[PDB]
Amino acid sequence: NWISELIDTYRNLMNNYEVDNAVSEIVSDAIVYEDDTEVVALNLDKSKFSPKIKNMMLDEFSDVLNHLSFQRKGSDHFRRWYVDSRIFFHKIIDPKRPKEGIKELRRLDPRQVQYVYFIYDTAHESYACDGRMYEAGTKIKIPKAAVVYAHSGLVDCCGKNIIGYLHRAVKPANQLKLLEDAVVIYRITRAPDRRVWYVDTGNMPARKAAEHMQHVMNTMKNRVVYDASTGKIKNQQHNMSMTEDYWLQRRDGKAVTEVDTLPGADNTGNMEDIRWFRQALYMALRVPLSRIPQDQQGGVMFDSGTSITRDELTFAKFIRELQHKFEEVFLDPLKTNLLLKGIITEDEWNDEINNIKIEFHRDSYFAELKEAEILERRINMLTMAEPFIGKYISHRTAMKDILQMTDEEIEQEAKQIEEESKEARFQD
Amino acid sequence: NWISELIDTYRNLMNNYEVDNAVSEIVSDAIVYEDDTEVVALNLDKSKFSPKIKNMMLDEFSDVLNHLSFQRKGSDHFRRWYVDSRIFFHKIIDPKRPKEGIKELRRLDPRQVQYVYFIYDTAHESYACDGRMYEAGTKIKIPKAAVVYAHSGLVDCCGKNIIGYLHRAVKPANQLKLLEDAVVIYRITRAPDRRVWYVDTGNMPARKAAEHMQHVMNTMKNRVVYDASTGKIKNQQHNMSMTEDYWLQRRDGKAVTEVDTLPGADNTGNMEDIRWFRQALYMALRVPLSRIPQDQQGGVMFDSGTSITRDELTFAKFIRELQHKFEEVFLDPLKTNLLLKGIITEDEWNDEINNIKIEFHRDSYFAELKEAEILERRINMLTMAEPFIGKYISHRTAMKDILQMTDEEIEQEAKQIEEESKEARFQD
Amino acid sequence: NWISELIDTYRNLMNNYEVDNAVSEIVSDAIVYEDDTEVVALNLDKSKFSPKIKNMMLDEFSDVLNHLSFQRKGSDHFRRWYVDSRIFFHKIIDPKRPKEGIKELRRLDPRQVQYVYFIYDTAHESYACDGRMYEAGTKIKIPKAAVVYAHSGLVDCCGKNIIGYLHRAVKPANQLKLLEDAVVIYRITRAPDRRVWYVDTGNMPARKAAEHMQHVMNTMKNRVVYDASTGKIKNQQHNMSMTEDYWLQRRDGKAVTEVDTLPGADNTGNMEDIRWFRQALYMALRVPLSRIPQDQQGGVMFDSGTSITRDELTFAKFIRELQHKFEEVFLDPLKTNLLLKGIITEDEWNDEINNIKIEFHRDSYFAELKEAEILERRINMLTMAEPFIGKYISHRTAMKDILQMTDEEIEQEAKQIEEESKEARFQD
């Protein structure tokens, strides 16, 4: 239940704006679709028994994505993992025969699952599984296999509870807005001039004294209105009074009946205040500040090509750490399906990972725009430390520590470059 | 009903300005008509049985656009999808014979449709379908086929409800204007000087005391007016009094009758306030801030050709994600018409998508102006790392990682470039 | 117990943001995963009996990481060491036979361990060890071997107690926030204009005097509201009153009934105050200030490649000192397993360390970007002091004190560079 109230407030963090902008900053590059290029490949770079089995996984893996319908439904499944604070896929298998094998993976609403042996609470009717039939309103129990349970790997203030990654920004977000209601509340109110009219009546009953109040309304009450639909001043057509005229009569021989205007909202503020808490909520999100929240006029800095800051570089790391947590949602539908189906056993799997890397695709554009500053500097070094490359540092030695190549890259290239010189078209 | 009240407030978000400017920012490039060039092509880049069937779709697809009348009615159907939060096209088929096949797709008003099996509520009389005749005022039921239902793929605060994409900006928009009425309300009011005239009368009945009030009006009341039609001061022709003169008589021997001017609207503000909430509503829209809301005098930054920022680059991604949601409105009138008509069955279709890409056309101008900075930098690298292209990195190796070409592009070109040299006109 | 309350407040330092940002600044580079490259290698650069035993450790050490599951669970085990202020791994061995040898290392919750002979307090049921069975709710005692106990090597104010490294920043952090509640508390309150209405009633019982108060509410009470869900003004549709009108009646012939508005929150501040304490908490963390907390517009400074400051250089030192404290968590599961298993005895081990260095991997990117300024300056010297290299300083002499090489590097290179000149491709 406490688990369930938590995934509420996270999802009412997304409801608000900016949090939505910054969270979908991440999911926009924590799994980035590109044209032609694929997302979430199964890099196999480890000792495997057959050249056929290592490629056989594609029959398994390029298909296990289909069940998630991952190609058009990925950046929601992940954006759910991250913001939900948990994500459960129920697994239908099989019912028979074994090694058929398996069936569609259906997402489960977090907040309807308890884990002490998974207790799926059912709101309304969701599914009939293999058998016997669709349960209704009852807590159905599913074993800790096979259900993929991927959690944001966070301990929390007191062990052991699951939290994040939005948590650290919940308190900050609740008090950035607690200013935006304050800043409009100050201005809305007092926007209209208010006036308190004190008129006195001594020694007359409230029954008939109020009659001396019914007369100062029906004679001097103001109907002037401003409507936000069309900005016109209703019941005042046409033109505007150059000036007003209110007429009060202090019945006694003393100055007690008067209008005292209540204060106008003088704008002393001076508002560097909210501008403080917005930079907070933004640091608390985990999104780099170099995304442009500020107007950032010009300046410019300046440079023709924006460089890799350490900010942005950090964040790629935060991401590629995420992807390695959401890595889970691929490896336990696969491994239980690659055991259900046959081939490799569990006792063989243990040694392979180790490394059976799942490569997410990065953004094609900033792979280049990063690898262009790396290579820009390595050539700038190399031109600079060039007249000495004959005299002090070998050619091989610079090529491998100024260019940061490796040996078999120089080997491969040295052989290759021979035919370039045979003969056209670069012979000058 | 709640669904229907929602699509109301979205459409009363468009009513306002800026929201209109920013929403039609999107639809201006989420489907961009250009001259000569076509919009919404059916890219077929997958294994298909016949060279004739893959081109046969044009008889199907270049015609399925006609039913939407998409060529002159596209940027409204989409601008409706996006802002409506839903979009339904009823499908007329057939009534007979099968594979005729089909008929015009008629848009349905959202807010008159309920989905639990589609319940089309009818306001007035809309259509007679194939049979039997035009229903009037009654909830007619249409099966979940065949009606194309395209929704903005959003879960909302509580599952499962449909929202967006305008939602996040609804609250912000309602309180940017709640300031613009405040800022005029402060100024309209008090624009005219108001004066409260206290004149006293002790120990005379209100019946005859009011007669001592009828005399201070008919002698000193001001008729001076300013009319907004023509800015002249009515009943004051010609010239303007150099100064005024009001005459009051404190009947008692004490200072109780007087004019107290009510405060003037002193402009202390100091208005960096609304300028806050307009930058909000604008971030909440999803339109990049680099569109020029600000005056942006000069500066300049400066550069002769405006570069691709990361802002703008992000947004192209947000768009091409939309287009892939509005992709739906093409593939289920087509697939149900490509099964109605014959040829490919449903069991064959499942493997094709996968990929049967629907290419929207981008803006011709900024394809270039982007592909000009990419290529500007790749040549700038290539000139810079040129003296080493003989010595360290092969020609092939640079051509494929400094220019980012591919092999069959170099293959194709190497063969091609031979005849350029045979012989004119570039031989110098 | 005091030990246990301490590890509470540290973990409620992490709960807060920024502390989380700065602590994971460290762990992001106190153990940095990289692709392909490994983390935590066992550098053996000392006299060892066999060429086989020195590599035999990998069977031992590349496996002792597996028990920690260090490859995907490292930057949590360390981030726990640092923030917890202690970290205990219980060691399961064996139960028989000896030299089997050993079993999984299970993390222990700090706050449930007392050391005077380790007293593991058990909350609920955690493990059954080899025998006899899982204890419940009782203080089980484990000998000071074998349990790895790694502490942040800090003495504290009074010897001998364990503290840090977060301690110095606890007081500062508790009073940066004691301002952020102050700064919103000032603004929240008074955000709404408050008015105190004094109305008088002399010589009437409180039983019936309150009836003269029930009437000024039900006639003049204001229901105008602003709701933060949707920013609209509830019960006020449509448009906004241009102005207000409140009507009070001083029953006596004297000015005693009136509205006195309570002060508005004038924003004199002038807030360079919190901006003070945030720079404190940030210096107290130990994270360099050159990470970009400030907006840091432009300027720029300027340079195309950001240099190694002395700040950043210091911090690498603070880190590599940490890693040498967390070095412990590798060497006592290894040495007790390399004695349990056999081979080297304790009397042999004493001489080896000395040096049996455990190399953490640094960040691949800033090894380069540091080693590029070092080498940039050594060449800049060398070009500058070049015409004299024939006349005054030898070639050997400059090569070894301008380039900072060593002899066997020049030896090795001089031999190598001969074949470069035999003959292609650099012969110009």
Numbering used by the authors:
A (entry chain B), B (entry chain A), C (entry chain C): 70 to 185, 205 to 516
Question: Mind quoting what the paper says about this structure?
Answer:
Of all these attempts, the construct gp20-N74 (residues 74–524) was found to have the best solubility and to give the best crystals. The final three-dimensional cryo-EM reconstruction had an overall resolution of 3.6 Å, based on the ‘gold-standard' Fourier shell correlation (FSC) using the FSC=0.143 criterion. The T4 portal protein assembly is dodecameric and has a length of ∼120 Å. The central channel has a diameter of about 44 Å at the upper end, decreasing to 28 Å at the narrowest point near the middle of the cylinder. The monomers can be divided into separate clip, stem, wing and crown domains. The clip domain (residues 279–358) consists of three β-strands and helix α6. The contact area between adjacent subunits of the T4 portal assembly is 4,100 Å2. This contact is, in part, stabilized by the clip region that contains a three-stranded β-sheet, consisting of one β-strand from one subunit and two β-strands from an adjacent subunit. A bent helix, α8, is 30-residues long (residues 399–428) and is connected to the stem region (residues 255–278 and 359–377) by the ‘tunnel' loop (residues 374–398). This loop protrudes into the central channel of the portal assembly and has lower density than the rest of the structure, suggesting flexibility.
